[PDB]
Amino acid sequence: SVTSDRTYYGYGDVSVKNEPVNVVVSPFSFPGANASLSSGGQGVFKKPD
Amino acid sequence: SVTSDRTYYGYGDVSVKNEPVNVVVSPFSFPGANASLSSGGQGVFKKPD
Ligand SMILES: [Ca+2]
Ligand SMILES: [Ca+2]
Ligand SMILES: [Ca+2]
């Protein structure tokens, strides 16, 4: 007696939470400790991490 | 839902404090002590430091 509207459903959800990367900074204080940078000087400074 | 502005930062500082050199002067009083410089005289005067 009923004319069914033939439509059933399925569903799902997608969760995009974080950003791809975290650029953790540990800044450099390049004259350093137990060192010295003078005017006109020339050299190299290294920070591994 | 958010469109991230994808920019992270890193930083560091450089410390140029001193001038390259210190010209310590210890002046000379060349007629010296226990010596004598006369008019028209000729000679040599030495200061090691
Ligand atoms: Ca993050
Ligand atoms: Ca140098
Ligand atoms: Ca100085």
Single-letter amino acid code for the residue at B4: S
In 3D, which of A21, A22, A28, A23 has the Cα closest to residue A48? A28
User: Strands A28-29, B12-13: parallel, antiparallel or unpaired by DSSP?
Assistant: parallel
Rounded to the nearest angstrom, the distance between the alpha carbon of B36 and the centre of ligand 1 is: 83
Structure tokens at A35: 């060192």
Tokens 């560091």, residue located: B12
Rounded to the nearest angstrom, the distance between the alpha carbon of B24 and the centre of ligand 3 is: 10
* B13/A19 CB distance under 8 A: no
∠ CA(B5), CA(B12), CA(B22), 5° rounding?
Answer: 160
Structure tokens at B12: 């560091």
Burial of A46 (0-12, 13-18, 19+ CB in 10 A): exposed
Report resolution in angstroms: 3.4
In 3D, which of B22, B15, B16 has the Cα closest to residue A40? B16
Best mutation site among A37, A42, A49 for testing chain B: the one with the most B CBs within 10 Å? A37
Experiment used for this model: cryo-EM
Query: Which parts of chain A are beta strand (E)?
Result: 28-29
> Minimal Cα–Cα distance from A8 to chain B, Å?
28
Single-letter amino acid code for the residue at A45: F
